[PDB]
């Protein structure tokens, strides 16, 4: 089966590491030469990796049960489908959980498991919450995270992400210790990097909302969520380690620039600057052909 990309403009692409629309394509800073994010990870032949799952509503979201009220609550997390999480499962953590250090802001909602006498429907409550992912309390692989905001113990919760609380401790390329400092992370999607001098990573960037403070925080993903979804659907065999892709202006049919789309599921370009890529609104990538690591990209 021939490999393809979905046909989607930048305005039709979603971030795979936070559930928001893409704002820009962006070339990696000089300091960012290797990354190992765990959401938005998928091989070109459709194998999801890391903590990647298919639903936008799963990205940086989680479900679980409140086990303790301390402003702070301990949550025993489940899989997103509500089934109990088995730490023995060969994934880094429940699929969808945040893959970066930061203070994730969203809303925790709670619907009671049973109805009160005289009520035909369950009681509900919900509150703003912060989920720190850089502290020892963030141990989703051990089945527990801590949130700060009442909430009932042993009643199920949903966390809907909105943005970051603030930029304190926001390091998008530092993978959390999913099982705490005593345990190595396991079953990680591998690190990716340019290996051709003068190439750098090409990111799909979103500027996340903030609850407060100064900032315009960026989260960069390797693949849009729709690309992950498409690759999984097609399951097209990869015929080499590198797919040459070109960004097309559809009304002219001309290629504006070219990029390497690597088998592991990430892109590199030939560029000397870290900056937003300025492109027409109607443009999109198209698969050209399979090449190899020695192929030299035209400067963009």
Author numbering: 225 to 294, 299 to 377, 382 to 532
From the paper:
The norovirus genome contains three open reading frames (ORF1 to 3), where ORF1 encodes the nonstructural proteins, ORF2 encodes the capsid protein (VP1), and ORF3 encodes a minor structural protein (VP2). The S domain forms a scaffold surrounding the viral RNA, whereas the P domain contains the determinants of strain diversity and recognition of attachment factors. There is considerable antigenic drift among human noroviruses, and new genetic variants evolve every other year, which can result in new epidemics worldwide. It is well known that human noroviruses bind with various specificities to histo-blood group antigens (HBGAs), which are present in saliva, on the surface of epithelial cells, and in mucosal secretions. To elucidate the constraints on non-HBGA binders from a structural perspective, we determined the X-ray crystal structures of the capsid-protruding domains (P domains) of two GII.1 (HV and noro485) nonbinders and one GII.2 (SMV) HBGA nonbinder.
Similarly, a GII.2 strain, termed Snow Mountain virus (SMV), also failed to bind synthetic HBGAs but weakly bound HBGA B type in saliva. In contrast, SMV infections of human volunteers were shown to be independent of the blood type. HV, noro485, and SMV P domains diffracted to 1.86, 1.50, and 1.60 Å resolutions, respectively. Compared to the P domains of HV and noro485, that of SMV contained an insertion loop (SMV numbering; Ala345 to Ala351) in the P2 subdomain, which was also observed in a GII. In the HV and SMV P domains, we found two loop regions with disordered residues in the P2 subdomain, i.e., no discernible electron density, which suggested a certain degree of flexibility in these loops. In the HV P domain, Pro295 to Asp296 and Glu372 to Asp375 were disordered, while in the SMV P domain, residues Gln295 to Asp298 and Trp378 to Asp381 were disordered. The equivalent residues in the HV P domain were Cys345, Arg346, Asp375, and Gly438; in noro485, they were Cys345, Arg346, Asp375, and Gly438; and in SMV, they were Asn352, Arg353, Asp382, and Gly445. In the noro485 and SMV structures, Asp375 and Asp382, respectively, were pointing ~180° away from the fucose, whereas in the HV structure, Asp375 was missing because of the lack of electron density. In HV and SMV, loop B could not be modeled into the structures because of the lack of electron density. However, our new data indicate that Asp375 in HV, Asp375 in noro485, and Asp382 in SMV are unable to participate in the stabilization of the fucose moiety of HBGAs because of their flexibility or suboptimal orientation.
